[PDB]
From a paper:
The nicotine oxidoreductase [name] is a crucial enzyme for the first step of nicotine degradation in [name] ([name] 28022). [name] from [name] [name], 6HLNO and 6HDNO from A. nicotinovorans, and the nicotine oxidase NOX from Pseudomonas sp. strain HZN6 (21) belong to the family of flavin-dependent amine oxidases. In the NicA1- or [name]-catalyzed reaction, flavin adenine dinucleotide (FAD) is required as a cofactor to couple the oxidation of nicotine with the reduction of oxygen to hydrogen peroxide. The structure of [name] comprises a FAD-binding domain (residues 49 to 129, 250 to 338, and 417 to 482) that harbors the cofactor FAD and a substrate-binding domain (residues 130 to 249 and 339 to 416) associated with the substrate nicotine.
To understand the molecular recognition mechanism of [name] for its cofactor FAD and the substrate nicotine, we first determined the crystal structure of selenomethionine (SeMet)-substituted [name] residues 21 to 482 [[name](21–482)] in complex with FAD at 2.05 Å resolution using the single-wavelength anomalous dispersion (SAD) method. An N-terminal cut and SeMet substitution were performed to improve the quality and resolution of the crystals. In both structures, there are two complexes in each asymmetric unit. However, as demonstrated by gel filtration chromatography, [name] behaves as a monomer in solution. The FAD cofactor adopts an extended conformation deeply inserted into the FAD-binding domain. FAD is tightly associated with [name] through extensive interactions between FAD and the FAD-binding domain. [name] presents as yellow in solution, which is consistent with the presence of FAD as the cofactor.
Residue numbers in the entry:
A (entry chain A): 51 to 485
B (entry chain B): 50 to 485
The structure:
C-alpha cells in the first residue's frame, strides 16, 4: 500500500534511464527532480543568437549504452566538423602565452598522451571491470602527476598534458587518480585516434533533452520538477521520502541518482554503510564551470590550453564569421581560479589569452556553485576507483546510480545511462519475484 | 482492428527476441513464431566429448554496443577463452602443402597483411554505422576483397593467411566478397587491429547465448510458438494474415520478419515485395559455411591453423586438450562444397592431412548451409550489395524487416541482429502507438 512502487530521485540521464526501465516493467513509477528543468549536468541553452551546450553533449558509438538508446529512439548524430585550426595556443602557469604551429601542437599532445597511456592494454584488458587486474589496484596509489613526472616530456608537452589532465580532473593533477584516465582511454579501443573521436565530434540529433524526453515519455512515469528530496527513511518494507516542503512520499524502493557531491543535503535513516559514508564525505574531485564569450573580432578556428594555475584551461571556437565575430567555448577546471559570472574578470582573462579582442557578451554556468551539482563531470581522486563497489552497493531498499557509480564511461552521459540500466535491474530483483 | 495479436515476430534468433522484447514491454499483444524446435537461430550451444560447444555465434565484446547494453540490462558478465602461447601455428596452401610456422612470425605476418588490407578504414568509414556516408565507400563497393589483396605486395605466407581469413569472413572465395563490408567491421572495432581482433573469439556470455535469448523473451511477456514455420504473409484489412505450414491463419496489426535473407524463398508475400528487396532475395548473402568439432586421441596442445580457400579446414583452433582427453578441435569450414562435415571418413582424412599421425575418436558438426531455416551461415555481402542495403531495410506497409543482414554496424554478428531488433521495435511503435 505504498504511494508508488518506485521513486527515482534526479532527472539527468541516470534517473531518466532508470525511470524508463521501471515504467516499462509496469511498476508505478515517480521521478522527483530538484530543479525546474530536466537534464541535470546536460543543459542546452542559447547565446548570441545560437544554441550552446552548458554541460555534457558529445557522444560516440564506442559508448555502448547511449548508442543503443539512440538506436532505440531513432536518433542520429550531428557532427561538429573537424577543420584545420588557424591558431593553437598554450598559456603556462605564470600566464605567458605561446603560439605554436597547429600541426606541431597536435603532434606534441599525441606524444604526451600516448606516453601517459602506454600501458592501458596491460592494466585494463577489461575496461568495464576496472579492478580486474592487480596492476590497476597498484596504480590506484598514484596520481596522474606522479606518472607525468616520469615521462621525459618537453616543457611544451608537459604543459599541454597537464592542462588536459587538469581539465579531466576539474582540479590540480596532484589530486587526480591515474587509473581512471587509463580506463577511459581503454574504453575507447585502447587507441588515441578512437578515444579522441569521442570528445567533441558528435552530438545527438534533437539534443540531450530530446533523448531525456523520449525516455520519460516512453516510461509512463509521473515526473515532478522543483521537488528537492531532503531525506529518506527505510520503514515498513519500503521507504519514506521527504521533500523540501515536508511532504512524505512512500514507495517500495528508491533509486538515488543525485551527484555524489550533493549527498550532504540528504538525511538517511538508518545510516548508510561506512564505505558509502566515506565517499559522501570525500566527494568526487571536479570543480569545473562552463563559459561562452562573444568577441567582436573574427579569430577563425582556434584552440588553447592553459595550465592549472590559470583559469581558461580549454578554449575552442564555437562559431565565427566576419558578421558574428567569434563565440569561444571555454571550460574552466577550477571555479576558484575565476568567477565566470563576473564579466570584467572574464574580459581581462580573455584579453590576456587573446590580446586585442573586444568582449561583447558572456554566458556562464557555474556547475560548482549550483546546489544540485556542487561540481562538474565525475573525476576520481587517488585511491577512489579501488573502492567504487562501496558507492555502487545497494543499501536495503535504497539503490544508487549516476555516472560516478558506473564502471565504464564514468565521465560521460554513457556512464549515467549504464548506471540507470543497472538500477532498473536491481529494482526488478526487489519487486518482481522469481515466481 | 480485432486482430489475433498486435504484432507477430517471425524468427527466434537474436533479432526476433530483441524485437519481441521491445514490443512486449510497450504492452502490445505479441507473438513470436519460430520454425525450429529450438530458439537461438544461428546461435546454438550443444555438447560433445563431455563438454559444451558452440555450433554457431557465441563471442561478443563491449565495443559491440547493442549486445553489450543488453548484457548490462540482464546482469550478464563475460566468460573468457584465455589467450595463451600457441604450441603450433600452421598454414595449408591451396595445393594442400602444410607449413608449421613459428607462432611469433605467424602472428606478425597476419597483422602486416590485415593492416595493409584495412589501411584506409578511417578515411572510408569515419561513421561505420552509416556505411554509405562517404563517396569513397560507394566507389569501393565496385571492388572485391581479392581486387584489393592483389595490390598489397604481400609475401606468399601473408597472402595465404589473409586470403584464408577473408574466405572465412565471406564463407566463399574472395573474388566474390565485397571489400567495404570488411573495412566497415574493422572500423566498428575502433579502427584498430588489436581492438578489432579482441572481438573475435575472446569473450562469451555468462549463461550462454540461450540465457540472453531466454532473458529477453521472459522479460517480453510474448507468447512463443516453436515448430511453427511461416509460409506466407498477406497484407489485408489494415493488418496482416500470417499462414503457417499447417495452414493455420493468424492475424495481426503488424509483422516483423527476422528470418535469414537466404530463407525468403520459403515465404509468399502479398502484395509482392519491392523490386529492390526482390533483387536481394534472389542474390541472397554469400556465406556457405559449416561448423565442425573433432575429438583426437593425441594431445596436440594449443594449436591454430589457416587453410586457404581451395581447402576445407579453413580455421582450426584447440577447444580443449589434456593427456586424458587428447584434443578437441574447433573448425570452421568456409564453403560446404569443399567437404561434407557429416561424412566422418572424409573429415578424418582431411584432419589427418593437416595433422599427420592423429587418430580421430569422434566428430560433431552443424551444416548451416543445408539447414532449411538458415541456408547459409553468418552474413557476408557480395560485390555491390552493401550499397543497396536500404532496399532490404525498408518497411513494406505493415511488414517490417530485421535480422543481422539488415543491420548497419556489426552485420556479421549477434550485435547486428540486436541492432535490427531495436529498429524493428521502433518501427512497430510508429505504426501502432499514434502521436495523439
Ligand atoms: C560542463 C560539462 C561538460 C560535459 N561534457 C560531456 C560531454 O560532452 N559528453 C559526455 O558524455 N559527458 C559530458 N559530461 C558529463 C555528463 O554530463 C554527466 O556524466 C552526466 O550528465 C551525469 O548524469 P547523471 O544522471 O549521473 O547526473 P546529473 O545529470 O547531475 O543528474 C542528477 C539529477 O539529480 C538532481 N538532484 C540533485 N539533488 C537532488 C535532490 N536532493 N532531490 C532531487 N533531485 C536532485 C539534479 O538536479 C539532477 O537533475 C559533462 C559534464 C559537464 C559538467
Ligand atoms: C558458425 C557461425 C559462427 C558465428 N560466430 C559468431 C560469433 O562468434 N559472434 C557473433 O557475434 N556472431 C557470430 N555469428 C553470427 C551470428 O550468429 C548471427 O549474426 C546472428 O545470430 C543472427 O541473428 P538473426 O536473429 O538475424 O538470425 P537467426 O539467428 O538466423 O534467426 C532467424 C530465425 O528465423 C527462423 N526462421 C527461418 N525461417 C522461418 C520461417 N519461415 N518461419 C519461422 N521462423 C523461421 C530460424 O529458425 C531462426 O531461428 C556466427 C554465425 C555462424 C553461422
Amino acid at each position: 500500500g505504498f504511494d508508488y512502487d518506485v521513486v527515482v530521485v534526479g532527472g539527468g540521464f541516470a534517473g531518466a534511464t532508470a525511470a524508463r526501465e521501471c515504467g516499462l516493467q509496469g511498476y508505478r513509477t515517480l521521478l522527483l527532480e530538484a530543479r525546474s528543468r530536466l537534464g541535470g549536468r546536460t543543459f542546452t541553452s542559447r547565446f548570441a543568437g545560437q544554441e550552446i551546450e552548458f554541460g555534457g553533449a558529445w557522444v560516440h558509438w564506442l559508448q555502448p549504452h547511449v548508442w543503443a538508446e539512440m538506436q532505440r529512439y531513432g536518433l542520429g548524430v550531428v557532427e561538429d566538423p573537424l577543420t584545420n585550426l588557424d591558431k593553437t595556443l598554450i598559456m603556462y602557469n605564470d600566464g605567458s602565452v605561446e603560439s605554436i604551429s597547429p600541426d606541431e601542437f597536435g603532434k606534441n599532445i599525441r606524444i604526451a598522451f600516448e606516453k601517459l597511456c602506454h600501458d592501458a592494454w596491460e592494466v585494463f584488458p577489461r575496461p568495464h571491470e576496472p579492478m580486474f587486474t592487480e596492476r590497476a589496484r597498484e596504480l590506484d596509489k598514484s596520481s596522474v602527476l606522479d606518472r607525468i613526472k616520469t615521462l621525459g616530456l618537453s616543457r611544451l608537452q608537459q604543459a599541454q598534458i597537464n592542462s588536459y589532465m587538469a581539465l579531466y580532473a576539474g582540479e590540480t593533477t596532484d589530486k587526480f587518480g591515474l587509473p581512471g584516465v587509463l580506463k577511459l582511454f581503454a574504453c575507447g579501443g585502447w587507441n588515441y585516434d578512437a578515444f579522441m573521436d569521442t570528445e567533441t565530434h558528435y552530438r545527438i540529433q534533437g539534443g540531450t533533452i530530446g533523448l531525456i524526453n523520449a525516455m520519460l515519455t516512453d516510461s509512463g512515469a509521473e515526473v515532478r520538477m522543483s521537488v528537492p528530496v531532503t531525506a529518506v527513511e527505510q520503514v515498513n518494507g519500503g521507504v519514506k521520502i521527504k521533500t523540501d516542503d515536508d511532504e512524505i512520499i512512500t514507495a517500495g524502493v528508491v533509486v538515488m541518482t543525485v551527484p555524489l557531491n550533493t549527498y550532504k543535503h540528504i538525511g538517511f535513516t538508518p545510516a548508510l554503510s561506512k564505505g558509502k559514508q566515506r565517499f559522501i564525505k570525500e566527494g568526487q574531485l571536479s570543480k569545473g564551470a562552463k563559459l561562452y564569450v562573444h568577441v567582436k573580432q573574427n579569430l577563425g578556428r582556434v584552440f588553447a590550453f592553459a595550465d592549472e594555475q590559470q583559469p581558461l584551461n580549454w578554449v575552442q571556437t564555437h562559431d565565427y564569421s566576419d558578421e558574428l565575430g567569434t563565440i569561444l567555448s571555454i571550460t574552466i577546471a577550477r571555479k576558484e581560479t575565476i568567477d565566470v559570472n563576473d564579466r570584467d574578470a572574464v574580459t581581462r582573462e580573455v584579453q590576456k589569452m587573446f590580446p586585442g579582442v573586444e568582449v561583447l557578451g558572456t554566458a556562464a554556468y557555474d556547475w560548482t556553485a549550483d546546489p544540485f551539482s556542487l561540481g562538474a563531470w565525475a573525476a576520481y581522486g587517488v585511491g577512489q576507483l579501488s573502492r567504487l563497489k562501496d558507492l555502487q552497493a545497494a543499501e536495503g531498499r535504497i539503490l544508487f546510480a549516476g555516472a560516478e557509480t558506473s564502471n565504464g564511461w564514468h565521465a560521460n552521459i554513457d556512464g549515467a545511462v549504464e548506471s540507470g540500466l543497472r538500477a532498473g535491474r536491481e529494482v526488478k530483483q526487489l519487486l518482481s519475484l522469481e515466481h
